[PDB]
Structure 1
């Protein structure tokens, strides 16, 4: 299926994924389209940050769901 990821710019990209895909697979599939390593990327879906090890279906991600990609401003 085809979901939406909203990059750092704000531009919307598309990803082909099955609902059985782990978040790591989704992050790795962002890496091929955007170049961002899976380490540095955080995914947010309706306020819940996505967790490595769960799958898209566990968060009820369906066609046309928009995932928000953000990074980490670390701090002290």
Structure 2
């Protein structure tokens, strides 16, 4: 299945993103690249005070539809 979540950047700008619970964090990064043009290696995704790990899924992190990730520039 699919759901909508949100990604909020430090500018305050918040964007919809269409994901699946089975998506790995790297796949979610891949979606942000298509929509916004940010390569995955310029991205960190934070939720619940943690940096989310590649190889884990949204379902593993218990991230609910209409939740909000923070998007952070990886340096």
TM-score normalized by the length of structure 1: 0.89
Decide which structure has greater helix share. 2
Unaligned runs of 5+ in 2: none
Q: Provide Cα deviations, 1:16-62, integer angstroms capped at 9, x if missing partner.
A: 11100011110000001111110010000010111110000111111
After superposition, residues 1-76 of structure 1 pair within 5 angstroms as: 1-72=3-74
Structure 1 residue ranges (4+ consecutive) displaced by more than 4 angstroms after TM superposition: none
Preserved CA contact (<8 Å) 2:44 2:72? yes
Equivalent pairs counted in the alignment come to 73
Structure with larger Rg: 1
Decide which structure has greater strand share. 2
Q: Please give the alpha-carbon distance, in whole angstroms, between the structure 1 residues aligned to 2:73 and 2:47.
A: 14
TM-score normalized by the length of structure 2: 0.90
Superposition RMSD on alpha carbons, in Å? 1.1
Unaligned runs of 5+ in 1: none
